[PDB]
Amino acid sequence: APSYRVKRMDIAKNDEECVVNAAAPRGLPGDGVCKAVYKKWPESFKNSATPVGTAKTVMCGTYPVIHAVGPNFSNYSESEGDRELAAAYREVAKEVTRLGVNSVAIPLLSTGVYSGGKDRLTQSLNHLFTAMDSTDADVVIYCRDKEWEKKISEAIQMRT
Numbered sequence: 001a002p003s004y005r006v007k008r009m010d011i012a013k014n015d016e017e018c019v020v021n022a023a024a025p026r027g028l029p030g031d032g033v034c035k036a037v038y039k040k041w042p043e044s045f046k047n048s049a050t051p052v053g054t055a056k057t058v059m060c061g062t063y064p065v066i067h068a069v070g071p072n073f074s075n076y077s078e079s080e081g082d083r084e085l086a087a088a089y090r091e092v093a094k095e096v097t098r099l100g101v102n103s104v105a106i107p108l109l110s111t112g113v114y115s116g117g118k119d120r121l122t123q124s125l126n127h128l129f130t131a132m133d134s135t136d137a138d139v140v141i142y143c144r145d146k147e148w149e150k151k152i153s154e155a156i157q158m159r160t
């Protein structure tokens with residue numbers, strides 16, 4: 001039966017059938033997760049640019065990289081940024097479905113450098129759940145912060 005799990009490690013080392021990149025705008029290599037995805041799957045950046053609020057899949061070999069561009073809350077208002085963040089996750093769920101994968105590795109979009117200086121764990125994770133609950137895939141959420149790992153794990157446990 002489909003599950004959610006959380007792991008505190010580099011998503012570029014995931015054990016799932018595809019990966020969601022927390023993509024920088026304009027198809028650029030970015031930083032953090034996006035830069036790690038660029039180092040591991042550089043071929044997946046060929047024509048990967050896609051607008052804020054959308055996702056675009058590019059294959060590296062046969063391994064799918066779903067580039068999802070969340071809003072940068074330093075540029076967006078809270079209300080418009082929230083809408084684009086929800087929309088990016090909804091496009092991820094559509095791509096996961098279209099690909100037919102059994103599992104997907106996902107980071108929390110619009111956190112950290114794109115968070116506008118605010119902790120958005122709950123906001124981003126709730127949009128992740130809303131989108132991915134519509135799919136049949138095992139979801140493995142990747143984070144790096146120890147307290148975030150606890151809170152995500154707590155949230156996963158209470159939906160079981």
Ligand SMILES: [Cl-]
Nearest residue numbers: 143144145148
């Ligand atoms: Cl984190």
